[PDB]
Amino acid sequence: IEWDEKTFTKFAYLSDPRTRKNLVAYVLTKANLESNKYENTIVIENLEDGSRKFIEDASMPRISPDGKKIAFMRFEKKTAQIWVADLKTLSAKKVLEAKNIRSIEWNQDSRRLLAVGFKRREDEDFIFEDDVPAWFDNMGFFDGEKTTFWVIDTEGEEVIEQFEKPRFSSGIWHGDSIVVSVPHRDVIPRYFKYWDIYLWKDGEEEKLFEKVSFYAIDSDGERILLYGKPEKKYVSEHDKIYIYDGEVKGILDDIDREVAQAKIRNGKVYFTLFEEGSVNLYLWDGEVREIAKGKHWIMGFDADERLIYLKETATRPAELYLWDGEERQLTDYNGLIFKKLKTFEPRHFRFKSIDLELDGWYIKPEIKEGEKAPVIVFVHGGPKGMYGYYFKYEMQLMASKGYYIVYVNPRGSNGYSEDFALRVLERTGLEDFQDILNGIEEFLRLEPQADRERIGITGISYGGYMTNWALTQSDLFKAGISENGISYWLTSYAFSDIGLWFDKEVIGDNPLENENYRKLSPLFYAKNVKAPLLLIHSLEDYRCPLDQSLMFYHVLKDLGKEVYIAIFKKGAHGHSIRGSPRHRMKRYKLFMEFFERKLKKYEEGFDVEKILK
Amino acid sequence: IEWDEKTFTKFAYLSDPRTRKNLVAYVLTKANLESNKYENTIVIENLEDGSRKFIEDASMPRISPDGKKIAFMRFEKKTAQIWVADLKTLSAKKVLEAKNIRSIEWNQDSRRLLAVGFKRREDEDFIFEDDVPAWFDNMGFFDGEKTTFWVIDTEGEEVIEQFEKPRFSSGIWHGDSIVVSVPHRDVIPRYFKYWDIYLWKDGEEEKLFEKVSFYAIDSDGERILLYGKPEKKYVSEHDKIYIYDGEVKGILDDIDREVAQAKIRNGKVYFTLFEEGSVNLYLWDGEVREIAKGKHWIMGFDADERLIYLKETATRPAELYLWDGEERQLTDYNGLIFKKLKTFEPRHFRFKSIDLELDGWYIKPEIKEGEKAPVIVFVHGGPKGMYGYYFKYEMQLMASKGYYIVYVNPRGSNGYSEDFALRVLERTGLEDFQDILNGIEEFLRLEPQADRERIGITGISYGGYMTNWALTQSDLFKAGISENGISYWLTSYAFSDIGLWFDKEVIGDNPLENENYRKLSPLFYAKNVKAPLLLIHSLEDYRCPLDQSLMFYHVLKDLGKEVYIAIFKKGAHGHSIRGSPRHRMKRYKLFMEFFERKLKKYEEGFDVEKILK
Amino acid sequence: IEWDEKTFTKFAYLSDPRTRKNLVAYVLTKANLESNKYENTIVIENLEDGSRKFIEDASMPRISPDGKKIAFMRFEKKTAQIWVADLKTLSAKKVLEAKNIRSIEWNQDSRRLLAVGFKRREDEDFIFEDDVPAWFDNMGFFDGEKTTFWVIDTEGEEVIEQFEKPRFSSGIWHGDSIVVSVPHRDVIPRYFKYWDIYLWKDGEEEKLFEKVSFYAIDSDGERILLYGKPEKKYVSEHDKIYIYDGEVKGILDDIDREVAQAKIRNGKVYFTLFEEGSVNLYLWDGEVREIAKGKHWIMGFDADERLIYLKETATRPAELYLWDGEERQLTDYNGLIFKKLKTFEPRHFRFKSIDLELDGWYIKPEIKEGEKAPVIVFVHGGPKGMYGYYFKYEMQLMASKGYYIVYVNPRGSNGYSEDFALRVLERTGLEDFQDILNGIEEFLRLEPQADRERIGITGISYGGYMTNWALTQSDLFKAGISENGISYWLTSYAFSDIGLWFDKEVIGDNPLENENYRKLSPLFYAKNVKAPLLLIHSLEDYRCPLDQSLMFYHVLKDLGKEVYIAIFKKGAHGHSIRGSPRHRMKRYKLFMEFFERKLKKYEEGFDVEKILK
Ligand SMILES: [Cl-]
Ligand SMILES: [Cl-]
Ligand SMILES: [Cl-]
Ligand SMILES: [Mg+2]
Ligand SMILES: [Mg+2]
Ligand SMILES: [Mg+2]
Ligand SMILES: [Mg+2]
Ligand SMILES: [Mg+2]
Ligand SMILES: [Mg+2]
Ligand SMILES: [Mg+2]
Ligand SMILES: [Mg+2]
Ligand SMILES: [Mg+2]
Ligand SMILES: [Mg+2]
Ligand SMILES: [Mg+2]
Ligand SMILES: [Mg+2]
Ligand SMILES: [Mg+2]
Ligand SMILES: [Mg+2]
Ligand SMILES: [Mg+2]
């Protein structure tokens, strides 16, 4: 095993942990480069033996409350199928052939499933829209989408109740009722901001909440768990969790950090928080108790009789763990790979920027006492993203190729106070960019072997914006790779999936008259660019549509700049990690070669035919 | 036969007339709604009998100079094939299997073909671009495209010479040499503005012209025919024609009208001009002589021993004609259809607008002396398009459904003086929009049965811009249909295929700082809209990309307006006429029903599922 | 070449002669046993050279009036296609893709075609009927069928007018009008008995005739040719022909024979008559003139500038001939085959039966002066069929295998006086059966080498009835082969396609109370059968449905008789001649082996697995 553009295929990727009784289930995913497909296997472990059994070419494991059965999905006919297996022998029957189903959940009776899906107009030749937005990242054109809710009897194998709601509605069981969360409608739907919440049973409903900034995420049959706030002024405010049983009770009213995920089982709540680069696991049982806190990201968890969770670190993809008073590692899927593959632990540093003290990290490559090394600055997305202790392939890969890697959490990031997150609103490219510069300055001080004359910068999404911006506002950088970014806020407002509300918040109100939409946009400062730039974009990214890269590309070419554009024919906003294996391999090889040829040692041109094959 | 959304399928569509000796060849096209395909048949007529023979599932007829053979193209394997047939018996052999060939032309020897095509990078997963623009309407993503030139021996069936040039190059035979026209390169290629022209033979070339605003279109073996000007300041200047034999000689130096098409055969030049709504055919033989001038559009022509041409009118698709001193109609393909299908001849009117007198037309529907009728205003594209005497399906169709149809040639249109065309530059939405208003005002004066309270407006491309604009600047209109339009000039500049140079000319220089890019853009005046609007767009339109409709749609919805968007999944800028038959049928039915339900008699909503099926 | 069950595949089968000017077209059909398909080739002969050209995998040749073009049909998609070719080079275009088209005819303009076809309900799971009958032989279940009429422009390639009529309507051109013949409706449609005739043009019609017993068959643009009678009491009456130009004029009022086919060209009528075993060709030009009269059947003919016809004989399939004052044979397709294959000319004899003198024929096999030979009696269908001088494969084949063949025209047959035909009505199995017995008795007198102890009998349809009947009413016969017959008239009345009207005529009125329906039915006399019988039936025979064979089979088995049944899975009433080649081969081999094993020399059983392979 060596680091290159294919190494990501050698890892086992775990997701969707579930537990009932003495059993754990989860999904093992492999990127198969030869077939160009992801392969999914459900693994069921019996904590009684450490014994494993399998359900092949399947995902979405849902263990029935009684622990007797497992439901799952399989995906010729472009149709999904819901299956049920007995957990003892894993013999299985097909229950329903289920196109456009997004979720499945058991009722407490271990007989009925709730499935939530969607339906669209589906004309062969044209999409027709009369609501907003017209598209959504990783979903496609809405085409008049409505949400569908089906109650499925797994014994008789029939939809026994069904109903529809507006697009982007969700539903959970609450005993024998269904809690339904629907975006609230004003001039447009208030997506990610306000919901109406209903209690549905037997074809009738009652409204529980009107225009609240939380939605229902879980239930234990007596109490409903709510996620968000009673009322947000900004979508960027920290989401919290509340127990509802008649009265709404905050259980983290005093903790100024955002909840990543949360579940309730038997009146206890298990939850994770974004905290200064980590995603940490806690329990609330009347008080908040630490379960798994460290330099790591708790990516998923479940609890029933046992508590299990997936923990990723800066140098290892997720593995599964069990907590019984102390943490026990359950799986070691990548252990043999990693015995042969060098990894680089980031070094944390603090630095001052303006009025704040912030977190940065860096990775130092294998160099000897007399040598200097080039530097890649990475900028995370969001702006309310967060770097720290998750596994970032490009950083390990570039470190292995002789680069320093440097990255910080500027104001606007998740993982800190709410106020720290909100500082970025209407200030994109201002103090946050200064924080990145100040982090780099401190890093250079700490590492005199870092070659100040060969610093590059890269990022995706907000990180792509900031790469664009950096090359227009500073002469520090020798090369840039900007991916799925922003060059012009006004088109983000009006063209992107979330722009109508999110740009109002992050950039400002009255967008057609607000000067900040030009003032804080890289497009308008294109003349300033002096460093070679690679723009990467994908055709199904509706979060940051194509214009954001292609306009910047054309305008930079109109100004005589050295710029290149790679337009991946498939893929949404997250394609760098969710595209097809072969697509992702080609992106990684482009990324590494652009920095080899423009940053480590500049050479003219970029003959992609030669460089890639 | 009745008028509705399918009637366009009942017509025979003729194109690509060719003549050598006593023979005429042309292509008969049918839109087959059931198969959802266009069918192409070459027809060869012998003017000796009016006898016809056929080459089925074929196009691009090219008769050899000696009149003995015909080359043609056919299109399983996504591959084009070049074939040669003997003209006596039409027995035929396949010569070359020819993906991405755009043109075929015989050498004077009746043995060699010149084929011009293209080649691209072709990676399965990503497009890579390092030139400009990254895409072109009706061509796709360039993906590093180069032009390819092949000399093909039709006897031995081999490419005997080949070479490449930059994208958007063209080539013609000139005796045993090839005249090669290549876009001139400054900071970017000067597309539609400057070319370098070379004379190529046997792998060597000499430059004939450098940075000239014409390219080579034809040759008679002694003289080269050039199209354009020696130097244009604006691409919008009238294109003229010149004979080159050592010296460049203008042959229309005194005629202030633009050439539509031109050919040279035996030192005579045949050409058409855009003239006040007509496209008229002339000959130059030392002086300019009228051949076919009237209320018509000469869509294509060829000349050798005989002169033939295709003539379309306001009420008939093209038919073929021969001129031998007087015009004789040769074909009557749609004669039986039109005996059963009512058509409406437009009435021409003049009107004053500001400082000018302009041409308008209108069609009056079957109404009786006591009734009033709604009105649809059509606006042509361009801005240097031209309405008048070609067959416009929607106008006939809507007239048949009880609507007045009104349309003018505002300043900026083709068909008048050069200065009249150039008036629009930096003034889009200003005097030209006034011309449209003044035309409507005169039409209403002329037709008191026209219901001033039910006037709608529609257009495609620049006509879509002007529909957008009209609904933002006037309260006259009750409904709009805007197709493949412009809402924001700055994104047209930076995102569209031609924007980097064409918007500079039509909107203005320094686009990132020029206030006219906001001042003359409908997007910024969305709050003003009061009339229901249907936006139509297609996903392969790179001339006016999607943002132009979808941004306007989202912003109008953000402002609480009644607006709808139809996004056709396939189709370039011209999809209303070049999309698949079923696609076009669905567009026509949407178009007619939106006006039925919003203009003739307003009703709420637009249930496209119900309205269309 | 030898006689056996495959020999029929070695012949060329000609049909559908057409002539315009100096050209003749016709269809050459081959039975391909290996592919199990019929192959059809149009042959065009130029009487100028005896030169031939071809249109492969095509039929229904229709030469345009101007002689410039030929329309034809071709039949993957279960769709028929209408094509047009230039007759000079035979280059061809597809004009219309034409499922369920039954006929095509040119207008006098050589531009428009009239196509007549049908349309049905077409539900995948069930046929639904509310008219009568529910099915028709060689057509299938009607499923609510209506007749469709399309006028097709072959230039523009469009249906320019269309209309529908009740099932079993027909249409011809009459100049620029269409003459439409529709079955007249009383309690049910009066199929084969009364029609209403209309003149149709441009979507309007006028009734020409009401409830008449003729329909329109041809026109020369001035006069309409009508076929039938002004009023028939019996459908079995001889059909005659009449010219209509305002007045209806009989042109064969004095000739007591039935017209087989007739055409009008330039006010002359060419027609054939059924005459004492021959089908003979005449002309009427004011008087009736003999053209081709002899021991033959004129199977088809056409006339324009030249007169051509297909002539079959007892020993040769049809060949083409031209008449220019004398008959010239044009084709000799089977001439080489027949040089090697022995044939047997029938010997005509007269005999007395009751009150009449009748025609019989027999064929004597190669036997020497001391030997006797078995005898097969063949009975033709109808009852108004006719034996004589057409090519009957089974007779030649059995003669070659050492059998006498004997066959007569009993009363009821075509080819004689009308009264002779009508004698059979209400008398089936009575005097007609006596005529067959008396013919056999005279034949035995004429041929003492005919073995009276080994006489068998066979027939199809009415001939199958009479085979059934003979075995129940006589002890003369040693074996029978009854095919697609009648055993019970009452089920013929109520189940068959034509029974509701035809059985009323041939058997009698008031069928539910008329004793003749039992008295003249073989089923009721099954106990009498002593000779082995093979019943052959086919599953798509709606003229004589399955019950007619299977009931007789079951009842004979219930009575302990030696009987066998072969049920061909496909095939209509005429399957012995129109079934697939392999189907027909297997029938011929069954037929010959049953007589070998039951008639020539009786052996027990019939092991069809062994006997056939
Ligand atoms: Cl079950
Ligand atoms: Cl050749
Ligand atoms: Cl034609
Ligand atoms: Mg692998
Ligand atoms: Mg099942
Ligand atoms: Mg869809
Ligand atoms: Mg949040
Ligand atoms: Mg605060
Ligand atoms: Mg059609
Ligand atoms: Mg070849
Ligand atoms: Mg490609
Ligand atoms: Mg021009
Ligand atoms: Mg001027
Ligand atoms: Mg054969
Ligand atoms: Mg066709
Ligand atoms: Mg059917
Ligand atoms: Mg008859
Ligand atoms: Mg009589």
Q: Who contacts A562 (Cβ-Cβ below 8 Å, separation ≥6)?
A: A532, A533
Are A544 and A484 spatial neighbours (Cβ–Cβ below 8 Å)?
yes
Domain definitions of chain A by residue range: 1-346, 347-613
Are B179 and B224 spatial neighbours (Cβ–Cβ below 8 Å)?
yes
Q: Closest Cα of chain A to B552: distance in Å?
A: 8
Peptide bond into C133 cis (omega under 30): yes
Tokens of B586: 């669905």
Of the ligands numbered here, which is closest to the C-alpha atom of C273? Answer: 17
Backbone dihedral angles phi then psi of residue A609, each to the nearest 5 degrees: -60, -50
Tokens of B163: 């070479």
Ligand 12 centroid from CA B313, angstroms: 22
Question: Is B94 annotated among the ligand-binding residues?
Answer: yes
Please tell me the distance from the alpha carbon of residue A386 to that of residue A54, in angstroms, as a whole number: 35
Contacts of residue B51 in chain C, CB cutoff 8 Å? 68, 86, 88
Of residues C93, C111, C160, nearest to B337 (C-beta): C160
Contacts of residue B56 in chain C, CB cutoff 8 Å? 91-94
- Please indicate whether, in this complex, the C-beta atoms of A567 and B141 are within 8 angstroms of each other: yes
Are B127 and B138 spatial neighbours (Cβ–Cβ below 8 Å)?
no
Of residues B130, B557, B567, nearest to A188 (C-beta): B557
Please tell me the distance from the alpha carbon of residue C99 to that of residue C116, in angstroms, as a whole number: 11
Cα distances from B609 to residues A133, A348, B577, in angstroms, run 20, 58, 23
Ligand 1 centroid from CA A154, angstroms: 6
Closest of B512, B524, B509, B545 to residue B426, by C-alpha: B509
Of the ligands numbered here, which is closest to the C-alpha atom of B64? Answer: 2
Tokens of C453: 């102890």
Ligand 12 centroid from CA B235, angstroms: 7
Question: Is B69 annotated among the ligand-binding residues?
Answer: no
Closest of A481, A482, A566 to residue B127, by C-alpha: A566
Please tell me the distance from the alpha carbon of residue B133 to that of residue B188, in angstroms, as a whole number: 9
CB atoms within 10 A of CB C124: 4
The number of C-alpha atoms within 13 Å of B78 and in the hemisphere containing its C-beta is 1
Please tell me the distance from the alpha carbon of residue B435 to that of residue B422, in angstroms, as a whole number: 15
Of residues B141, B547, B568, nearest to A491 (C-beta): B547
Ligand 12 centroid from CA B230, angstroms: 13
DSSP sequence for A144-191: T-EEEEEEEETTTTEEEEEEEEETT-EEEEETTEEEEEEE-BSSSB-T
What 3-state DSSP class applies to C574?
A: coil
Nearest CA in chain C to B335: C156
Contacts of residue B569 in chain A, CB cutoff 8 Å? 124-127
Q: Closest Cα of chain B to A551: distance in Å?
A: 5
Tokens of A468: 């664009």
Nearest CA in chain B to A488: B491
- Please indicate whether, in this complex, the C-beta atoms of C160 and B340 are within 8 angstroms of each other: yes
Question: Which neighbouring-strand residues pair with A56?
Answer: A41
β B373-379/B404-408 pair status: parallel
b/e sequence A264-296, b meaning 16+ C-beta within 10 Å: bbeeebbbbbbbbbbbbbbbbeeeeeebbeeeb
Closest of C441, C347, C457 to residue C398, by C-alpha: C457
Contacts of residue B337 in chain C, CB cutoff 8 Å? 153, 156, 158, 160
Question: Is B56 annotated among the ligand-binding residues?
Answer: no
**Contacts from A329-332 at CB under 8 Å and sequence distance 24+?**
A330/A24, A330/A45, A330/A47, A330/A50, A331/A14
Interface residues on C facing B, Cβ-Cβ cutoff 8 A: 68, 85-86, 88-89, 91-94, 97, 111-112, 153, 155-158, 160-161
What 3-state DSSP class applies to B249?
A: strand
Ligand 16 centroid from CA C99, angstroms: 11
Please tell me the distance from the alpha carbon of residue B21 to that of residue C269, in angstroms, as a whole number: 46
Question: Is B153 annotated among the ligand-binding residues?
Answer: no
Closest of A262, A344, A253, A252 to residue A298, by C-alpha: A262
Contacts of residue A545 in chain B, CB cutoff 8 Å? 547
Please tell me the distance from the alpha carbon of residue A390 to that of residue A317, in angstroms, as a whole number: 8
In the CATH scheme, what is the code of domain A347-613? 3.40.50.1820
Q: In degrees, to the nearest 5, what angle opens at C-alpha A49 toward C-alphas A45 and A51?
A: 45
Peptide bond into A448 cis (omega under 30): no
Question: Is C239 annotated among the ligand-binding residues?
Answer: yes
- Please indicate whether, in this complex, the C-beta atoms of A121 and B609 are within 8 angstroms of each other: yes
H/E run at residue C307: strand C307-313
Tell me how far the alpha carbon of residue A109 is from its chain's centroid: 33
CB atoms within 10 A of CB A517: 21
Tokens of B247: 């010296």
- Please indicate whether, in this complex, the C-beta atoms of A586 and B133 are within 8 angstroms of each other: no
Ligand 10 centroid from CA B157, angstroms: 6
Nearest CA in chain A to B564: A130
Helix and strand tally (H, E) in chain B? 12, 38
Q: Closest Cα of chain C to B376: distance in Å?
A: 30
Please report the resolution in angstroms. 1.6
Q: Which chains contact C through at least 3 pairs of Cβ atoms less than 8 Å apart?
A: B
Please tell me the distance from the alpha carbon of residue B76 to that of residue B440, in angstroms, as a whole number: 51
Are A282 and A272 spatial neighbours (Cβ–Cβ below 8 Å)?
yes
Contacts of residue C94 in chain B, CB cutoff 8 Å? 39, 56
- A121, A129, A191, A549: which to substitute to probe chain B, counting the most B Cβ within 10 Å? A129
β B450-460/B479-483 pair status: parallel
- Please indicate whether, in this complex, the C-beta atoms of A125 and B491 are within 8 angstroms of each other: no
Instruction: Write the single-letter amino acid at C291.
Output: I
Method: X-ray
Closest of A29, A30, A4, A13 to residue A588, by C-alpha: A4
Contacts of residue B558 in chain A, CB cutoff 8 Å? 132, 187-188, 500
Q: Which chains contact B through at least 3 pairs of Cβ atoms less than 8 Å apart?
A: A, C
Contacts of residue B50 in chain C, CB cutoff 8 Å? none
